[PDB]
Design an enzyme around this catalytic site. Structure first.
Site, PDB file in Angstrom:
ATOM      1  N   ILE A  24       0.861  -1.203   0.000  1.00 16.28           N
ATOM      2  CA  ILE A  24       0.000   0.000   0.000  1.00 16.28           C
ATOM      3  C   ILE A  24       0.889   1.242   0.000  1.00 16.28           C
ATOM      4  O   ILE A  24       0.553   2.206  -0.741  1.00 16.28           O
ATOM      5  CB  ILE A  24      -1.004  -0.027   1.175  1.00 16.28           C
ATOM      6  N   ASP A  70      14.300   2.688  10.101  1.00 16.16           N
ATOM      7  CA  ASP A  70      13.537   1.689  10.868  1.00 16.16           C
ATOM      8  C   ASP A  70      12.595   2.465  11.807  1.00 16.16           C
ATOM      9  O   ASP A  70      13.063   3.046  12.812  1.00 16.16           O
ATOM     10  CB  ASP A  70      14.482   0.757  11.607  1.00 16.16           C
ATOM     11  N   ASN A  97       2.405   4.585   7.256  1.00 20.00           N
ATOM     12  CA  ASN A  97       1.904   3.401   6.531  1.00 20.00           C
ATOM     13  C   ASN A  97       2.550   2.122   7.066  1.00 20.00           C
ATOM     14  O   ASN A  97       1.856   1.089   7.073  1.00 20.00           O
ATOM     15  CB  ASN A  97       2.094   3.519   5.014  1.00 20.00           C
ATOM     16  N   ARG A 130       4.269  12.514  15.551  1.00 20.78           N
ATOM     17  CA  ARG A 130       4.939  13.541  16.388  1.00 20.78           C
ATOM     18  C   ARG A 130       5.934  14.315  15.518  1.00 20.78           C
ATOM     19  O   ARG A 130       5.864  15.564  15.467  1.00 20.78           O
ATOM     20  CB  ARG A 130       5.651  12.944  17.601  1.00 20.78           C
ATOM     21  N   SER A 147      -6.992  -0.265  10.185  1.00 19.27           N
ATOM     22  CA  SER A 147      -7.424  -1.519   9.541  1.00 19.27           C
ATOM     23  C   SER A 147      -8.913  -1.699   9.804  1.00 19.27           C
ATOM     24  O   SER A 147      -9.339  -1.285  10.887  1.00 19.27           O
ATOM     25  CB  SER A 147      -6.660  -2.681  10.116  1.00 19.27           C
ATOM     26  N   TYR A 161      -3.033  -7.606  16.798  1.00 19.55           N
ATOM     27  CA  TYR A 161      -3.022  -6.702  15.621  1.00 19.55           C
ATOM     28  C   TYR A 161      -4.220  -5.736  15.691  1.00 19.55           C
ATOM     29  O   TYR A 161      -4.049  -4.505  15.522  1.00 19.55           O
ATOM     30  CB  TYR A 161      -3.045  -7.530  14.346  1.00 19.55           C
ATOM     31  N   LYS A 165      -4.160  -1.354  15.953  1.00 20.48           N
ATOM     32  CA  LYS A 165      -4.861  -0.438  15.012  1.00 20.48           C
ATOM     33  C   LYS A 165      -5.962   0.360  15.708  1.00 20.48           C
ATOM     34  O   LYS A 165      -6.164   1.527  15.348  1.00 20.48           O
ATOM     35  CB  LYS A 165      -5.367  -1.233  13.805  1.00 20.48           C
ATOM     36  N   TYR A 206      -7.947 -15.352   7.564  1.00 23.01           N
ATOM     37  CA  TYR A 206      -9.211 -14.587   7.399  1.00 23.01           C
ATOM     38  C   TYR A 206     -10.307 -15.471   6.776  1.00 23.01           C
ATOM     39  O   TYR A 206     -11.501 -15.168   6.928  1.00 23.01           O
ATOM     40  CB  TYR A 206      -8.992 -13.313   6.573  1.00 23.01           C
TER      41      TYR A 206
HETATM   42  N1  LIG Z   1      -2.885  -5.592   3.093  1.00 16.82           N
HETATM   43  C1  LIG Z   1      -3.970  -5.547   3.837  1.00 16.82           C
HETATM   44  O1  LIG Z   1      -4.878  -6.227   3.590  1.00 16.82           O
HETATM   45  C2  LIG Z   1      -4.096  -4.547   4.953  1.00 16.82           C
HETATM   46  C3  LIG Z   1      -5.337  -4.364   5.546  1.00 16.82           C
HETATM   47  C4  LIG Z   1      -5.486  -3.416   6.537  1.00 16.82           C
HETATM   48  C5  LIG Z   1      -4.366  -2.693   6.898  1.00 16.82           C
HETATM   49  N2  LIG Z   1      -3.195  -2.862   6.340  1.00 16.82           N
HETATM   50  C6  LIG Z   1      -2.114  -2.013   6.783  1.00 16.82           C
HETATM   51  O2  LIG Z   1      -1.628  -1.280   5.730  1.00 16.82           O
HETATM   52  C7  LIG Z   1      -0.277  -0.957   5.891  1.00 16.82           C
HETATM   53  C8  LIG Z   1       0.553  -1.600   4.756  1.00 16.82           C
HETATM   54  O3  LIG Z   1       0.257  -2.949   4.549  1.00 16.82           O
HETATM   55  P1  LIG Z   1       0.823  -3.804   3.331  1.00 16.82           P
HETATM   56  O4  LIG Z   1      -0.146  -4.689   2.954  1.00 16.82           O
HETATM   57  O5  LIG Z   1       1.312  -2.874   2.393  1.00 16.82           O
HETATM   58  O6  LIG Z   1       2.039  -4.467   4.030  1.00 16.82           O
HETATM   59  P2  LIG Z   1       3.329  -5.129   3.403  1.00 16.82           P
HETATM   60  O7  LIG Z   1       3.099  -5.506   2.083  1.00 16.82           O
HETATM   61  O8  LIG Z   1       3.690  -6.113   4.350  1.00 16.82           O
HETATM   62  O9  LIG Z   1       4.356  -4.006   3.481  1.00 16.82           O
HETATM   63  C9  LIG Z   1       4.881  -3.618   4.702  1.00 16.82           C
HETATM   64  C10 LIG Z   1       5.629  -2.317   4.541  1.00 16.82           C
HETATM   65  O10 LIG Z   1       5.998  -1.790   5.790  1.00 16.82           O
HETATM   66  C11 LIG Z   1       7.354  -1.467   5.816  1.00 16.82           C
HETATM   67  N3  LIG Z   1       8.023  -1.699   7.102  1.00 16.82           N
HETATM   68  C12 LIG Z   1       8.055  -2.826   7.759  1.00 16.82           C
HETATM   69  N4  LIG Z   1       8.788  -2.741   8.853  1.00 16.82           N
HETATM   70  C13 LIG Z   1       9.253  -1.535   8.896  1.00 16.82           C
HETATM   71  C14 LIG Z   1      10.097  -0.771   9.809  1.00 16.82           C
HETATM   72  N5  LIG Z   1      10.584  -1.379  10.889  1.00 16.82           N
HETATM   73  N6  LIG Z   1      10.346   0.487   9.488  1.00 16.82           N
HETATM   74  C15 LIG Z   1       9.863   1.044   8.423  1.00 16.82           C
HETATM   75  N7  LIG Z   1       9.089   0.401   7.587  1.00 16.82           N
HETATM   76  C16 LIG Z   1       8.746  -0.843   7.745  1.00 16.82           C
HETATM   77  C17 LIG Z   1       7.984  -2.410   4.779  1.00 16.82           C
HETATM   78  O11 LIG Z   1       9.217  -1.950   4.316  1.00 16.82           O
HETATM   79  P3  LIG Z   1      10.493  -2.879   4.198  1.00 16.82           P
HETATM   80  O12 LIG Z   1      10.158  -3.944   3.345  1.00 16.82           O
HETATM   81  O13 LIG Z   1      11.529  -2.006   3.742  1.00 16.82           O
HETATM   82  O14 LIG Z   1      10.724  -3.323   5.517  1.00 16.82           O
HETATM   83  C18 LIG Z   1       6.903  -2.491   3.722  1.00 16.82           C
HETATM   84  O15 LIG Z   1       7.007  -1.384   2.883  1.00 16.82           O
HETATM   85  C19 LIG Z   1       0.111  -1.581   7.207  1.00 16.82           C
HETATM   86  O16 LIG Z   1       0.128  -0.662   8.244  1.00 16.82           O
HETATM   87  C20 LIG Z   1      -0.924  -2.672   7.414  1.00 16.82           C
HETATM   88  O17 LIG Z   1      -1.114  -2.992   8.773  1.00 16.82           O
HETATM   89  C21 LIG Z   1      -3.040  -3.736   5.359  1.00 16.82           C
HETATM   90  C1  LIG Z   2     -11.183 -11.192   3.383  1.00 19.05           C
HETATM   91  C2  LIG Z   2      -9.766 -10.775   3.839  1.00 19.05           C
HETATM   92  C3  LIG Z   2      -8.615 -11.475   3.413  1.00 19.05           C
HETATM   93  C4  LIG Z   2      -7.339 -11.082   3.800  1.00 19.05           C
HETATM   94  O1  LIG Z   2      -6.215 -11.792   3.339  1.00 19.05           O
HETATM   95  C5  LIG Z   2      -7.175  -9.964   4.642  1.00 19.05           C
HETATM   96  C6  LIG Z   2      -8.326  -9.251   5.067  1.00 19.05           C
HETATM   97  C7  LIG Z   2      -9.609  -9.661   4.648  1.00 19.05           C
HETATM   98  C8  LIG Z   2      -8.251  -8.003   5.947  1.00 19.05           C
HETATM   99  O2  LIG Z   2      -9.266  -7.415   6.304  1.00 19.05           O
HETATM  100  C9  LIG Z   2      -6.844  -7.599   6.378  1.00 19.05           C
HETATM  101  C10 LIG Z   2      -6.684  -6.490   7.214  1.00 19.05           C
HETATM  102  C11 LIG Z   2      -5.412  -6.126   7.635  1.00 19.05           C
HETATM  103  O3  LIG Z   2      -5.274  -5.051   8.496  1.00 19.05           O
HETATM  104  C12 LIG Z   2      -4.267  -6.839   7.252  1.00 19.05           C
HETATM  105  C13 LIG Z   2      -4.436  -7.944   6.382  1.00 19.05           C
HETATM  106  O4  LIG Z   2      -3.323  -8.653   5.950  1.00 19.05           O
HETATM  107  C14 LIG Z   2      -5.706  -8.313   5.967  1.00 19.05           C
HETATM  108  C15 LIG Z   2      -5.766  -9.539   5.031  1.00 19.05           C
HETATM  109  O5  LIG Z   2      -4.745 -10.111   4.706  1.00 19.05           O
END
Ligand SMILES: NC(=O)c1ccc[n+]([C@@H]2O[C@H](COP(=O)([O-])OP(=O)(O)OC[C@H]3O[C@@H](n4cnc5c(N)ncnc54)[C@H](OP(=O)(O)O)[C@@H]3O)[C@@H](O)[C@H]2O)c1
Ligand SMILES: Cc1cc(O)c2c(c1)C(=O)c1cc(O)cc(O)c1C2=O
Ligand SMILES: NC(=O)c1ccc[n+]([C@@H]2O[C@H](COP(=O)([O-])OP(=O)(O)OC[C@H]3O[C@@H](n4cnc5c(N)ncnc54)[C@H](OP(=O)(O)O)[C@@H]3O)[C@@H](O)[C@H]2O)c1
Ligand SMILES: NC(=O)c1ccc[n+]([C@@H]2O[C@H](COP(=O)([O-])OP(=O)(O)OC[C@H]3O[C@@H](n4cnc5c(N)ncnc54)[C@H](OP(=O)(O)O)[C@@H]3O)[C@@H](O)[C@H]2O)c1
Ligand SMILES: NC(=O)c1ccc[n+]([C@@H]2O[C@H](COP(=O)([O-])OP(=O)(O)OC[C@H]3O[C@@H](n4cnc5c(N)ncnc54)[C@H](OP(=O)(O)O)[C@@H]3O)[C@@H](O)[C@H]2O)c1
Ligand SMILES: Cc1cc(O)c2c(c1)C(=O)c1cc(O)cc(O)c1C2=O
Ligand SMILES: Cc1cc(O)c2c(c1)C(=O)c1cc(O)cc(O)c1C2=O
Ligand SMILES: Cc1cc(O)c2c(c1)C(=O)c1cc(O)cc(O)c1C2=O
Lengths: 264, 260, 261, 260
Positions: A24, A70, A97, A130, A147, A161, A165, A206
């Site tokens: 993202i 980091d 993010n 901050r 999330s 988790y 959030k 999930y």
């Molecule tokens: N994908 C979903 O379904 C979902 C749903 C709800 C919320 N979210 C939230 O959306 C945000 C991004 O999710 P994503 O799906 O993009 O995750 P992702 O694919 O796992 O990517 C994680 C990102 O966070 C960075 N990161 C990890 N550790 C770090 C650190 N110590 N310092 C700085 N950066 C760091 C990583 O960078 P490096 O690789 O360089 O470490 C990578 O760019 C997160 O906050 C996650 O909780 C995701």
């Molecule tokens: C139907 C469904 C499948 C998924 O794989 C996720 C989710 C929902 C989801 O809501 C989600 C929220 C989140 O904060 C991190 C995730 O990796 C997730 C998910 O990975």
């Protein structure tokens, strides 16, 4: 009539996005570049990916640099923001993010796992906010990442988790009050299932019988969550972030927007 | 496709002769939509909004329809599609405000508010679903009084909007069979004639101050120290009804500048 | 030995208390020591069974016919309650009807059938409760976990009818404070009643394909406690809210669904 | 079985030497529970609570444990079970407040608040789940500041409690495998040393007024025109942890007298 209205542009603005090498954050960084922002791409572990995001932003006619930091370490957050302003002269937009996912029944959660998740997801985001308040121009924008698991969806073995959030939702409401003295707005996006490395890592947790299906199959079943019958993608989230950080998004302040295509 | 634009789309906005509806109608026209400007009582203001949308280079027509009357809602949507050939976007905006202690609320007053704010909006969404192109947009109008803010003597109005918040959540499920998204916007205090009509009832001892003083004191509700304006709401509606707003679905977005 | 939550010397009125949740509430308030006005519109023999159970328990009850779609019948219901018991302390607005249909199929007649009872009816039951209650009394309104917590296809009309209730109770708590009356709602999940059996097919995926009994067993798995909601579950919460001890819950909607997902 | 009583049950309340915890502990004893009174800093107050519970005819013991330290949480629950033979009810109550603009919050202050209010509560729930009888009760303590009321300079505390609201909803799913219900209570302004320590931060120019004067002003937050007291919160906890509270599960009950 001599003017065609182009909404939501960020020309002349500088954005920073934590964890924007992948997933993202990457799609947010590219979308803000597309809208005219110059972009600080932050990574911790993935310099190869951060370079591709920087190149993608330069390619569509904006500018970008990657800075390793980091964001669990407050001293590294301070340096990230200091380096951002030194390089581009100013900062208008900060998107927090970076995050990690976790799954575990309450009974099996350790101190080490609690600290791994909160240090980045909650404590890291807090101190990114901050340092953003302290470095941003008046009239700037702070975004935090929550999330749909914080409030809307209640997944078994997802307490650690979900709680990491839920803190963010509360921070953004109060931060909007504090950050008002610089006319900075503060909001969160709360994505649903969004197809990224994180999604594939945990989609089995999930889906009801998830371990018994293939990754591709789990992706297809997640697409039926939304009454629109498709997955969420990183661009779906980036588009909402682009609206909130635009001049036009100003009157959305202190809110958490759930961005899940209407998931059930 | 310029991000955030509505070129080639047709929109309809209930109560768009004045207030928030007028700002929404002009904004959708500015983004490239053709607009059906609905009015019930304000034909002259409606024509001015039409003439503004034509001047900025889109097209628009004013259609009269009392959205308390379901037969007039059907006719409004039928005439919209007949004029422009299609409809992609329907914004249910028309509403009335009401104040009074529970003990003083009459059947007449309950019916006046719910007939427009709740029943009217419900049947606007029903006709929108029936007339809209696949991939279209329904927006309904709530209030930050539905959930976020608990004002004394505001129960009728607050409940009228609380129903809308529930409707959009389920409407997103029903309308997904045409890939139509359904959301609500819940403005805070937004400077219109509705705002000036009742700003006394939202300010503590509000009768005690002047209209301009009431507007200044509302300005301090936001940490941004300004009032909300119709344009602030219009910009959020524009984003939701764009291609780029698709992944916001079944939600209520509160648009109040972070008001306390 | 401390006996918490009693209602001795208090008078309660429950709308639609001949059957289902209303009947469980009326019996519960009687068990805690309240005298009870049992309202019915169509089920006089059910209402008399409820009155008889409350007298058997050691309290006093009367059944009063009133269609709470009609504001004049609401005014008469409250006037007759105060004429008979001398006073009213507790008003529970419970009467409701369920509805299912896709938005596209919902008629004016069906919109009006649901809102007249679920929303307008409840509003005016609250109005007449405020006007008739003793200072320090209690108003309870009935919502649904469908208003905010769950989003069921083809359930927009009913879900909206209850979302209005949630907003009413918050503002009613402000207005009703001038008589020290607290106002709350209960928002049940699936609770085994005539209503439950009428529509369980619409809440369960491919519900029409199973027996009413099978649908009930499937709904039992919604809660992590692996059982159905029952009328008593809801009556127990209403009993706490209308007690002296419940005072500091005010202007709230309590979702009572055993933690359903 | 007397409706609402806890005869034959054993309860544990963190931080029950004083404030809300003390009222919870005495209330659960009044209802017939045996009570484990935890303290970290207030041994003499904890003993007074124990003596109160013995005086009204139940049994109690005070156990010292710093619930910032997970090994001390483990020992608290081990010693509770070793003393009374079982545990049915666990109330996570210990907390600290904090005020400060986001720009001024240190690492040391973030950790001071989250270590007790969020991490400590999480591990109290973990050890409760591991020690509790089937059909038991976990209660965690949030605040009306987590969601309902947005006070300037209150971000760190509000977030500490926002995490709790999310924990209880998912804990209810995990703890269902022992038929344990999990809920939070979110008090409003409740007259304790915490209330008095920061009542100036919840009032404009608050630092002017006396403590009693600030308490009188807070009493007008409620439409009932009184303050909340520890007993008001303890009565709600007593209902939730009773047999009759079972169908409230995974919920946050705001207990603020309808505060605005
Ligand atoms: N994908 C979903 O379904 C979902 C749903 C709800 C919320 N979210 C939230 O959306 C945000 C991004 O999710 P994503 O799906 O993009 O995750 P992702 O694919 O796992 O990517 C994680 C990102 O966070 C960075 N990161 C990890 N550790 C770090 C650190 N110590 N310092 C700085 N950066 C760091 C990583 O960078 P490096 O690789 O360089 O470490 C990578 O760019 C997160 O906050 C996650 O909780 C995701
Ligand atoms: C139907 C469904 C499948 C998924 O794989 C996720 C989710 C929902 C989801 O809501 C989600 C929220 C989140 O904060 C991190 C995730 O990796 C997730 C998910 O990975
Ligand atoms: N202003 C605020 O602070 C605020 C805050 C929250 C929510 N809202 C909501 O936002 C919406 C617009 O408010 P506003 O401030 O713009 O109010 P407004 O200035 O009073 O405008 C009211 C609009 O409603 C239309 N309308 C009234 N009766 C109608 C009918 N019977 N049929 C069709 N249209 C009708 C009016 O058109 P005619 O003149 O032609 O009748 C007019 O366009 C409403 O739903 C309101 O509840 C406003
Ligand atoms: N069961 C559930 O799962 C559930 C879930 C959430 C919320 N609810 C709500 O809980 C409440 C009670 O539901 P239930 O399951 O007990 O429903 P039920 O089994 O269908 O009983 C309905 C009650 O409402 C009364 N009623 C109907 N029309 C009335 C009228 N015009 N005037 C006065 N009373 C009238 C009926 O009395 P007569 O027979 O005398 O007409 C009856 O006592 C409703 O408001 C319902 O919406 C139920
Ligand atoms: N207005 C309010 O009062 C209010 C409003 C909303 C929420 N709350 C919440 O309600 C809960 C109780 O608050 P209160 O008003 O009673 O506060 P309080 O009067 O300050 O009492 C604090 C309690 O926490 C215990 N505690 C502190 N540090 C501890 C540690 N390291 N280990 C174990 N216990 C510890 C204290 O015991 P020792 O003295 O032994 O350390 C004391 O019993 C808190 O979670 C608070 O956030 C209070
Ligand atoms: C501080 C303030 C002053 C106001 O006049 C209003 C409001 C807030 C407000 O929230 C509001 C909501 C609404 O749905 C209709 C209104 O007329 C309003 C208002 O008029
Ligand atoms: C799993 C499940 C099965 C059901 O039959 C119902 C429900 C849930 C439910 O939530 C419900 C809410 C309501 O307000 C009325 C009902 O009849 C109901 C139900 O009937
Ligand atoms: C009107 C008012 C006055 C107060 O002093 C408090 C509060 C409200 C309040 O909500 C509050 C919440 C809390 O979690 C801790 C507190 O110390 C508090 C308070 O101290």
């Amino acid at each position: 009539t001599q003017d065609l209205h182009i909404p939501g542009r960020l020309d002349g603005k500088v954005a920073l996005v934590t964890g924007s090498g992948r997933g993202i954050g990457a799609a947010v960084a590219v979308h803000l570049g597309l809208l005219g922002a110059k972009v600080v791409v932050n990574y911790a572990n993935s310099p190869t990916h951060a370079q591709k995001v920087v190149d993608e932003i330069k390619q569509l006619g904006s500018d970008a640099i990657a800075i390793k930091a980091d964001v669990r370490q407050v001293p590294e957050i301070v340096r990230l923001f200091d380096e951002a302003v030194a390089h581009f002269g100013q900062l208008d937009i900060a998107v927090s993010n970076s995050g990690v996912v976790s799954f575990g029944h309450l009974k099996d959660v350790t101190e080490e796992e609690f600290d791994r998740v909160f240090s980045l997801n909650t404590r890291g985001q807090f101190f990114v906010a901050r340092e953003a308040y302290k470095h941003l121009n008046n009239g700037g924008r702070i975004i935090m990442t929550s999330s749909n698991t914080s409030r809307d969806f209640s997944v078994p073995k997802h307490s650690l988790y979900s709680g990491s959030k839920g803190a963010i939702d509360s921070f953004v409401r109060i931060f909007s009050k504090d950050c008002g003295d610089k006319k900075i707005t503060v909001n969160a996006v709360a994505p649903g299932g969004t197809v990224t490395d994180m999604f594939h890592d945990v989609s089995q947790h999930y889906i009801p019988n998830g371990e018994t299906y293939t990754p591709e199959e789990r992706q297809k079943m997640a697409a039926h969550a939304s009454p629109l019958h498709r997955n969420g993608f990183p661009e779906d989230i980036a588009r909402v972030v682009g609206f909130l950080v635009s001049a036009e998004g100003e009157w959305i302040n202190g809110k958490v927007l759930t961005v899940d295509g209407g998931a059930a």
